[PDB]
Amino acid sequence: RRKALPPRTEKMAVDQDWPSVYPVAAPFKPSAVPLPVRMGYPVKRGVPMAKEGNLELLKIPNFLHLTPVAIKRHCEALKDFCTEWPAALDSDEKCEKHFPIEIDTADYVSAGPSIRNPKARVVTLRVKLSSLNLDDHAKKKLIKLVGDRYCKSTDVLTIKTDRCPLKRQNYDYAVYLLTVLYHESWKTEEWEKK
Amino acid sequence: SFFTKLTADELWKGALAESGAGARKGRGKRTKKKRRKDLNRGQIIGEGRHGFLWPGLNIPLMRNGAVQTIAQRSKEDQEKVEADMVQQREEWDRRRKMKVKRERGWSGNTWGGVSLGPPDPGPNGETYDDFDTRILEVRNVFNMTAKEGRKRSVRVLVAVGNGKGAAGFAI
Amino acid sequence: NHNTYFALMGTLRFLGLYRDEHQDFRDEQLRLKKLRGKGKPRKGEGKRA
Amino acid sequence: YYVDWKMLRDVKRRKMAYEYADERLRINSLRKNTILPKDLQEVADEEIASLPRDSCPVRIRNRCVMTSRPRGVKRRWRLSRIVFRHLADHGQLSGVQRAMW
Amino acid sequence: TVDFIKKQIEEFNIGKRHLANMMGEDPETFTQEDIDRAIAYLFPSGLFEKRARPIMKHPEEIFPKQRAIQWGEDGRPFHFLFYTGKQSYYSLMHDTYGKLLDVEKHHNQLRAKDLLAEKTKILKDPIGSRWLIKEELEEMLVEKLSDQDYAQFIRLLERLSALPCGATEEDFVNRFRRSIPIQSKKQLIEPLQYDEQGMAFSRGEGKRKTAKAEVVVYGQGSGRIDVNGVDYLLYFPVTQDREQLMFPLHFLDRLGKHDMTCAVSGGGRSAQAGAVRLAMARALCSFVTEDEVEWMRQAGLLTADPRVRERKKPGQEGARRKFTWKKR
Amino acid sequence: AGFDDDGSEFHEHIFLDKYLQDFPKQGPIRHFMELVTCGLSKNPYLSVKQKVEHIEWFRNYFNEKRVILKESGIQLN
Amino acid sequence: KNRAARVRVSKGDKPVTYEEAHAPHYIAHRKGWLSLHTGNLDGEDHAAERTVEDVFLRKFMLGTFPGCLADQLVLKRRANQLEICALVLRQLPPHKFYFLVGYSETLLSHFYKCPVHLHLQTVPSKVVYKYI
Amino acid sequence: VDVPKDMTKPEITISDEPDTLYKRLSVLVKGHDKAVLDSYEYFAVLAAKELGISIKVHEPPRKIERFTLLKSVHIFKKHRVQYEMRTLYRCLELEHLTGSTADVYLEYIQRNLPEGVAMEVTKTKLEQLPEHIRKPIW
Amino acid sequence: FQDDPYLIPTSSVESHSFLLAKKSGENAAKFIINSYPKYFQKDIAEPHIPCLMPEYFEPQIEDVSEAALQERIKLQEPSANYNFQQREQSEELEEATEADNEKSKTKAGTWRTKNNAERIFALMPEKNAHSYCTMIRGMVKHQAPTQALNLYTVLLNNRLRADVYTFNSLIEATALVVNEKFEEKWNNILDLLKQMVTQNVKPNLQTFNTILKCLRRFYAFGKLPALQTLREMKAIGIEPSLATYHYVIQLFYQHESPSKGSSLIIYDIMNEVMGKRFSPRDPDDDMFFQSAMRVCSSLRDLELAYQVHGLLNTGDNWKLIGSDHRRNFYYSKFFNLLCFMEQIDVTLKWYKDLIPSVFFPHSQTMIDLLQALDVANRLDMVPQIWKDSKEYGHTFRNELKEEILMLMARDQHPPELQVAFADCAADIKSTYESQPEWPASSLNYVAVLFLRAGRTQEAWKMLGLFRKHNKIPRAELLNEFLDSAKASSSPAQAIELVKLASAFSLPVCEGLTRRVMAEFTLTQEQREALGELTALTS
RNA sequence: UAAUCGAUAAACCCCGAUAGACCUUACCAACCCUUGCCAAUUCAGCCUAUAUACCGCCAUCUUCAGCAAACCCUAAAAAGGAACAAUAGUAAGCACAAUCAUAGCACAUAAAAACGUUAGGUCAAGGUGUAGCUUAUGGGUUGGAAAGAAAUGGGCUACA
RNA sequence: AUGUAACAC
Numbered sequence A: 001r002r003k004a005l006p007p008r009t010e011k012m013a014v015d016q017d018w019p020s021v022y023p024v025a026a027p028f029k030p031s032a033v034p035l036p037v038r039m040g041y042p043v044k045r046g047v048p049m050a051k052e053g054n055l056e057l058l059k060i061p062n063f064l065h066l067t068p069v070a071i072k073r074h075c076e077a078l079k080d081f082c083t084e085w086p087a088a089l090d091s092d093e094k095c096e097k098h099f100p101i102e103i104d105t106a107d108y109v110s111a112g113p114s115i116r117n118p119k120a121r122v123v124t125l126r127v128k129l130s131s132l133n134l135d136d137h138a139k140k141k142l143i144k145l146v147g148d149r150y151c152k153s154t155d156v157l158t159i160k161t162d163r164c165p166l167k168r169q170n171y172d173y174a175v176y177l178l179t180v181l182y183h184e185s186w187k188t189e190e191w192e193k194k
Numbered sequence B: 001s002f003f004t005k006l007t008a009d010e011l012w013k014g015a016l017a018e019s020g021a022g023a024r025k026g027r028g029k030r031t032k033k034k035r036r037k038d039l040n041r042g043q044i045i046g047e048g049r050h051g052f053l054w055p056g057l058n059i060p061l062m063r064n065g066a067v068q069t070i071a072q073r074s075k076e077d078q079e080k081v082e083a084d085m086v087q088q089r090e091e092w093d094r095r096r097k098m099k100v101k102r103e104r105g106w107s108g109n110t111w112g113g114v115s116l117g118p119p120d121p122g123p124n125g126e127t128y129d130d131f132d133t134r135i136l137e138v139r140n141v142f143n144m145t146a147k148e149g150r151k152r153s154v155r156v157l158v159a160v161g162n163g164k165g166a167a168g169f170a171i
Numbered sequence C: 001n002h003n004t005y006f007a008l009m010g011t012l013r014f015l016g017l018y019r020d021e022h023q024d025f026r027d028e029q030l031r032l033k034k035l036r037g038k039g040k041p042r043k044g045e046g047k048r049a
Numbered sequence D: 001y002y003v004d005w006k007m008l009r010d011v012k013r014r015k016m017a018y019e020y021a022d023e024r025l026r027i028n029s030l031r032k033n034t035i036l037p038k039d040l041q042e043v044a045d046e047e048i049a050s051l052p053r054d055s056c057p058v059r060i061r062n063r064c065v066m067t068s069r070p071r072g073v074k075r076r077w078r079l080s081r082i083v084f085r086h087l088a089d090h091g092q093l094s095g096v097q098r099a100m101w
Numbered sequence E: 001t002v003d004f005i006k007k008q009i010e011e012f013n014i015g016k017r018h019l020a021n022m023m024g025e026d027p028e029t030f031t032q033e034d035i036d037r038a039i040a041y042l043f044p045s046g047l048f049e050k051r052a053r054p055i056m057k058h059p060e061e062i063f064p065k066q067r068a069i070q071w072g073e074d075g076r077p078f079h080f081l082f083y084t085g086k087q088s089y090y091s092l093m094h095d096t097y098g099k100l101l102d103v104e105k106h107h108n109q110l111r112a113k114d115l116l117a118e119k120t121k122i123l124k125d126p127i128g129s130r131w132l133i134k135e136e137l138e139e140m141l142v143e144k145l146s147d148q149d150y151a152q153f154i155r156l157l158e159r160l161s162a163l164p165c166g167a168t169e170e171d172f173v174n175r176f177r178r179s180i181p182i183q184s185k186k187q188l189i190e191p192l193q194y195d196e197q198g199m200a201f202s203r204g205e206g207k208r209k210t211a212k213a214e215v216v217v218y219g220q221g222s223g224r225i226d227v228n229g230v231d232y233l234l235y236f237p238v239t240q241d242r243e244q245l246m247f248p249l250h251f252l253d254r255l256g257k258h259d260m261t262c263a264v265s266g267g268g269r270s271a272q273a274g275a276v277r278l279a280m281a282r283a284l285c286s287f288v289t290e291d292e293v294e295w296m297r298q299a300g301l302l303t304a305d306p307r308v309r310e311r312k313k314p315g316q317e318g319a320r321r322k323f324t325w326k327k328r
Numbered sequence F: 001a002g003f004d005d006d007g008s009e010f011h012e013h014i015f016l017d018k019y020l021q022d023f024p025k026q027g028p029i030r031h032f033m034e035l036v037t038c039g040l041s042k043n044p045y046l047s048v049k050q051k052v053e054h055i056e057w058f059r060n061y062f063n064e065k066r067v068i069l070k071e072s073g074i075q076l077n
Numbered sequence G: 001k002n003r004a005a006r007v008r009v010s011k012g013d014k015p016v017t018y019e020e021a022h023a024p025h026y027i028a029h030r031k032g033w034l035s036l037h038t039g040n041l042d043g044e045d046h047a048a049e050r051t052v053e054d055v056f057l058r059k060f061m062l063g064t065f066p067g068c069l070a071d072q073l074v075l076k077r078r079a080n081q082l083e084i085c086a087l088v089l090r091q092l093p094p095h096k097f098y099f100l101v102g103y104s105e106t107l108l109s110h111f112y113k114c115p116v117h118l119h120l121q122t123v124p125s126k127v128v129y130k131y132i
Numbered sequence H: 001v002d003v004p005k006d007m008t009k010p011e012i013t014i015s016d017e018p019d020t021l022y023k024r025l026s027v028l029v030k031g032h033d034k035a036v037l038d039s040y041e042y043f044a045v046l047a048a049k050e051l052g053i054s055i056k057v058h059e060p061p062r063k064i065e066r067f068t069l070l071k072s073v074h075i076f077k078k079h080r081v082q083y084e085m086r087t088l089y090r091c092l093e094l095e096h097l098t099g100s101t102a103d104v105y106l107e108y109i110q111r112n113l114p115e116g117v118a119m120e121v122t123k124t125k126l127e128q129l130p131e132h133i134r135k136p137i138w
Numbered sequence I: 001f002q003d004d005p006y007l008i009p010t011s012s013v014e015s016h017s018f019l020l021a022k023k024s025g026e027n028a029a030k031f032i033i034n035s036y037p038k039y040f041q042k043d044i045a046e047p048h049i050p051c052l053m054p055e056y057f058e059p060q061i062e063d064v065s066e067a068a069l070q071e072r073i074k075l076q077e078p079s080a081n082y083n084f085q086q087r088e089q090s091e092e093l094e095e096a097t098e099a100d101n102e103k104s105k106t107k108a109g110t111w112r113t114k115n116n117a118e119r120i121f122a123l124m125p126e127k128n129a130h131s132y133c134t135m136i137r138g139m140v141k142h143q144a145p146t147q148a149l150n151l152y153t154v155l156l157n158n159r160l161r162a163d164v165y166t167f168n169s170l171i172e173a174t175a176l177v178v179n180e181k182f183e184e185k186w187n188n189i190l191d192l193l194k195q196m197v198t199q200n201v202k203p204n205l206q207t208f209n210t211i212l213k214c215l216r217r218f219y220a221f222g223k224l225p226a227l228q229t230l231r232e233m234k235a236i237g238i239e240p241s242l243a244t245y246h247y248v249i250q251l252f253y254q255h256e257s258p259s260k261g262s263s264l265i266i267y268d269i270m271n272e273v274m275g276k277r278f279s280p281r282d283p284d285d286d287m288f289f290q291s292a293m294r295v296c297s298s299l300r301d302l303e304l305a306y307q308v309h310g311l312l313n314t315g316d317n318w319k320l321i322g323s324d325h326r327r328n329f330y331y332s333k334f335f336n337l338l339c340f341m342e343q344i345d346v347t348l349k350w351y352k353d354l355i356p357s358v359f360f361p362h363s364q365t366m367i368d369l370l371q372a373l374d375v376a377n378r379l380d381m382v383p384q385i386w387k388d389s390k391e392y393g394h395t396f397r398n399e400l401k402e403e404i405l406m407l408m409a410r411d412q413h414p415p416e417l418q419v420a421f422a423d424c425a426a427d428i429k430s431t432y433e434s435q436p437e438w439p440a441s442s443l444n445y446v447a448v449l450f451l452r453a454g455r456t457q458e459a460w461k462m463l464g465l466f467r468k469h470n471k472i473p474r475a476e477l478l479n480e481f482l483d484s485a486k487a488s489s490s491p492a493q494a495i496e497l498v499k500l501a502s503a504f505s506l507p508v509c510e511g512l513t514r515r516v517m518a519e520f521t522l523t524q525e526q527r528e529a530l531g532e533l534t535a536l537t538s
Numbered sequence J: 001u002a003a004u005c006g007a008u009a010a011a012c013c014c015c016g017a018u019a020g021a022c023c024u025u026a027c028c029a030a031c032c033c034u035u036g037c038c039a040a041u042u043c044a045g046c047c048u049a050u051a052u053a054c055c056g057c058c059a060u061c062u063u064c065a066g067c068a069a070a071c072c073c074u075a076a077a078a079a080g081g082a083a084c085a086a087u088a089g090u091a092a093g094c095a096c097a098a099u100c101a102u103a104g105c106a107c108a109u110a111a112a113a114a115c116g117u118u119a120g121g122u123c124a125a126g127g128u129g130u131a132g133c134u135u136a137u138g139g140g141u142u143g144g145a146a147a148g149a150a151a152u153g154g155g156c157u158a159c160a
Numbered sequence K: 001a002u003g004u005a006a007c008a009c
């Protein structure tokens, strides 16, 4: 007993909305799509293949759940979740006076059962040295203490930490390195007078 | 070793060796006979040698309006169903080893005098069941080519006739 | 883990949810060989007998 | 079943390598340092030589995971070149194509 | 297959309406480039063959033009040249020869009445006229032709067009006339730029063998060139490379009237010198008038050098040289 | 996500000085152990319990082998 | 002669699918990839495990839909969920289609420890691109 | 015309903790084909303009990783078959952006990531000073 | 379900079949996982999903009683074997292991119940708060309330209090056995409620819900103490349950058939209901939407159905109706109301929203669109719903052929729709002549359709094909097609009609004969008229 | 020598090997184990023979343009099938061509190159038909694989 | 200048 039904194209209305049909990621099922779409290399007398029984349309990624009207609806839904950026921090220079420390961290996404990427442990802490209370002699001791991590042109200090298993432990170790450099830069010891 | 194995089409194509160089020119037919049997014929899809009885493949979903449970037949039922399968296999073998008798026209091995029934209908829908066609000569004719060397071309001569006075011959 | 792969797929083959054409081919060829009469001997009978 | 007895022996060799991997590290730490006394170092050579043979990382052979070819294997896919070509010409691997420039 | 074409037309219209619905645009102004970017957004195939990408167009454009039914229900053919095998092509030759005979008869009547009121309009060379390609004539006649038949038809068309011309016959001929685009190798002269009280400075880009060169030149200074912050003599010790730096200025007799500064990256010394030479040549077009720009073109300054190092082939040594081939 | 490394902080991973308390303070044992603990501080892939296991293995090794340190030529505790 | 992933020219009667009708040098020119996943990029890891999972999926679907499977699978990997896209003939009852769908879903979810989707399109016969 | 009523049920709880501020957030997507990356760029820019982010997108140069393999099974080293992997990059720069907006934008982009691509996010954030540095000296 | 048209279920039986097939596939694959756990031991997912691991149904330690007891309890027979193994080695089971074993016996499973009772009380003085709990919910299923009352007495000797489920099952046990006196059980329920207040236990939602469940199956006029119970619920501040509200609707529905005062009380209280978002925290909330639609289908009102549909749509759509069976009951009576108490413009618009999506029609909702279009005089709408009912209604089609086709003669036929009429006739009368009782009413309808369409030969062929089926229509059809052939001047058809009517003895053969003398006088065929008379007299 | 194998005219000779100190290793000498990887199997396992049985992957003619299903004709037909001012040839298709890549055309390169020939290479990537073992042609451990009387191919460094 | 002796439709 064989049964055959016409697809959803005949029952599809003119003014029906598409995000109600396609909520999430889909394999481009051709029965629910009313568009006659053709892809494939044609024969010299032939035409490209239609949407039924075609694996190239099954291979291709689809943006049918990302139609622009659906983008407007979804972003109007996410509008309640977002918060406003401060008006006083609009400029890079005022950001430089207010928040001098910037921290580069990375998160990675991949298709697979495993989440962990070993390069995700890295933490790169950058500080402009003009925003601190280092003295002259303490500043010179800071450059001779840290060496290559300080840029002589743009006057920035960059500490990259890798050794800790977690990004929070790397962040704590980097900010610990910054504060121990600050506390040990001011110390004048007995061999510093020679 | 599960990744190592292959597909039945590849296995049969490597087994019968129909594309080999022996059958190409005519070098074959000395000691060459391979038979292809479809192994997916008598499969009930859910049949297994342990004998598990599945609610969708082997037996239907609903009994007395209720939902059936996953069950297993008895061992005695297992050699009964296995006996039915293997007896189907020698039934297929008995049907396969039976050969149709070839009606001889003039001699035992020649094609002279053998009839081929009515000729094929034409493009206009005309159908000729009253004519009969007979082979008078079969002859293997060879040709010399640049690539293949010997090129065997079978030519035959037949006659058609309805028995009412209309007859013809062709090659 | 090829052992677990082969064991799982063999158990599915005998439980009749997966159908394996290659082991079907080996079973049919061994059946034809035993029908012809040239099979695998018992362990220990080959050399002295 | 693995496809070959060489594959089976390499699985066992990797197993004893993981089982004894820490002790080789601990002994070779004593071995590869010149601050340690030589009287201790020759002893450390004695317990590194008394270890089982198949626990060493140099006995680990990179074979194909499909057909166990001993050589011609790409390290990224762990596949032999014939099997890699067989899956690559059928388009079963993403991003791999016949090269044209 | 006519009803198939009508079905394709109507479901193409319905699918166009659904595509306008799912984009949220105006369906009355929804056009073919909108369809193209719509399909390129919704089904984004990255494929090197441009014909293998997903398309939804007019079914008349996609489906090939088909032969109609050639006979009635009684078996009688509609057209009187059906038994020639090529009815449309031979009807076209019949119509062309009928027009040629009518032209000859009308011109004989005009000769008898002693009037020559026609003119030779065969020369459409300022328009850039060409006849139909055999593929285009096959598409028009919806039938396969041959090169000999095509040459026969074109020489009959020349026979018709070389005669005195009537308006109907010129309208018949101009169906088969095609126009070429504009043929010109004249470059676009970049206008001079004035910036912060500096007069007549120009900019040029050069590329030769991986070396990219920016050259900016001032017409208000003396003759010196500053390459990458150092002097040209220090940067290019090679006298040949300094001659490459000379060559456009000595070609235009303006060696000391321009002050240049340069930024070149990549390649070696001769590649950088050639890139700087091409960049100075392209930068000097603003100062220099049009006939001397063409003189530059036939001197070969303004044309880029396509000689790029080839790829090494597998089984070979240096992309031409193979290994030592042993005969036995 | 899901791996907190048993709630450990960076000070248990970096500074291993509190497990070096029972060692000969002036010999080559301190040299060897500060190289080892510098390696354990630099290593990202290894857990703190296994680092304690490595230090206790080294302690156990130097505890079983005592006489060879005496005939080495330097006296170590 | 080049013989990889090609169908040989017979008398003119063998039906051919679009993927079998194109030579491997048409991959990413005219035909695409039957599997899409992350691990084959430039600076990305874990390609071999995805490769062996790909292989085991091809053999398991080929033996799980015996004869009613038309042609090669489409295997999509997108944020740990694995989409298996199939062309299946109208051979078996839809009872048996849904039985095998639920069975394959639960079995592969518990075997690769990841969420699985089984997406099917069921066709009358093998789709013919050329010859015939 | 069958309209279900009161579809909205949000759960937003505002904590007393100050929200994290990011200076910049770089999204580098890598893919195999250009059209998917182009359409995904259009999607991301449209979501960015409706969220009010005012972003800049640039294309980093591609790199191609090439290798050579043997053509035959047994012995033919003169004739080789070469393979090619193509990766393409698109980079989104996100400037002057907050924490909850960062989270919801990133997860909306992440759940709408297609099958054949990957991406890295690089977050540089705003933090004034630790509590042991501000103005003490030992 | 997969929305591929081969896999789209045509009917509700096919929908249930496909869903249970997928569930059987899930159960079969999980059976494979639990049968062979060693093949799934390897973990690839690093965040380590615990539900994806295979589950062990085996006891961990075999011969140790204190572990093996609870191990075989947490999986009936195994718990009994573990208890027997603990008892045979003189190992004393404590008050917790015996409680778990008694709970495992009561959750699964009548002489073994008394044996388990002797096991509970004879060996150890096991605590009341497990022992009476287990046994009193056991003899609810095992039908023995006297022992439950005896355990209640034994509990009240031993100073311990009675919880909410105690008075639940005990009010059920006292109420369910009635020997010709309902007041003696109602007063006992009142005394148990008073002692529930006395023993310092707060009476829960399901306590008064269980009292109402007791009140349901005895009196139709026992709804006054049910209303006082409902108001006592609203007094104490606990939000009332939808099972309770369903049971109130059940009594007031039983009272609805004599008088509608109970119905207006229902409508007032649901008018109080309709403004709240709902959280179904009760297990018995399944038949609520069944009964609240049953009262509306009984009293034929629809604005109430509008706001109850909004109530279904408001909080959460699917979690308040338990089964697909009661869900198609809901939608069938919902369309039974909406078809005739609203207009066609919204009826056809919710027709395409509900019927091809939610459930496929049964016969009660098949007949009613047919009577609604016949009331509203809508003839254009017939072929599309016929093509729909061909899909969803193959079972009821032969039973409802006449009731489908009875609309076709009530209206008048303009000449624009004759293609649709001819197709709707031709598909039915090709399918049921290619095979099946087929009535003559459809012959009347098809003949008046081709009479209005002006086609004589196909209608004559159809009547001739019906009279090859060894039965005849009535003579009004014969006169109607005789008028059709009289307007078209066809004498041989009239000859065949009258000959095969006189051979089959119609009662109005005299009228047919007089009509064909009129026909043959009009067409001047009086010689063949006299020939027909000669044939009839022979 | 106790001590692998294959290739071995163009189309072998830094060739399987984009790779041998043990491992790889299939070789040899000593020792050992025979339901001996697996859920099960009067069964596993074999780098044992046949590339003259094969599939899979290729070399060569070859940057040669031809191959071929289905028809038609020849005062027979083994076979052949064209004359453009045209004298029997139509021909779906595969090759060539066209298209595509080397991020703009163009050129060039790459890629492609049909049917077939050399019973051309590969049972040792892997599976396999047939023919041979099953206390051994199978499975493990240890130790060893020399060497140049000579000839020759391809390279590197030079002879300034 | 030559190249013997086991090809099967």
Ligand SMILES: [Mg+2]
Pocket (backbone or CB within 6 Å): B108, B109
């Ligand atoms: Mg004979």
Ligand SMILES: [Mg+2]
Pocket (backbone or CB within 6 Å): D003, D004
């Ligand atoms: Mg093997």
Ligand SMILES: [Mg+2]
Pocket (backbone or CB within 6 Å): D058, D060, D061
């Ligand atoms: Mg190695």
Ligand SMILES: [Mg+2]
Pocket (backbone or CB within 6 Å): E318
């Ligand atoms: Mg060179």
Ligand SMILES: [Mg+2]
Pocket (backbone or CB within 6 Å): none
């Ligand atoms: Mg060999």
Ligand SMILES: [Mg+2]
Pocket (backbone or CB within 6 Å): none
């Ligand atoms: Mg040899």
Ligand SMILES: [Mg+2]
Pocket (backbone or CB within 6 Å): J009, J120
């Ligand atoms: Mg040779």
Ligand SMILES: [Mg+2]
Pocket (backbone or CB within 6 Å): none
């Ligand atoms: Mg050895």
Ligand SMILES: [Mg+2]
Pocket (backbone or CB within 6 Å): none
């Ligand atoms: Mg060796």
Ligand SMILES: [Mg+2]
Pocket (backbone or CB within 6 Å): none
């Ligand atoms: Mg061996």
Ligand SMILES: [Mg+2]
Pocket (backbone or CB within 6 Å): J051
């Ligand atoms: Mg060969």
Ligand SMILES: [Mg+2]
Pocket (backbone or CB within 6 Å): none
């Ligand atoms: Mg050989």
Ligand SMILES: [Mg+2]
Pocket (backbone or CB within 6 Å): none
């Ligand atoms: Mg040609």
Ligand SMILES: [Mg+2]
Pocket (backbone or CB within 6 Å): none
């Ligand atoms: Mg010929």
Ligand SMILES: [Mg+2]
Pocket (backbone or CB within 6 Å): J091, J093
């Ligand atoms: Mg052809």
Ligand SMILES: [Mg+2]
Pocket (backbone or CB within 6 Å): none
């Ligand atoms: Mg191009």
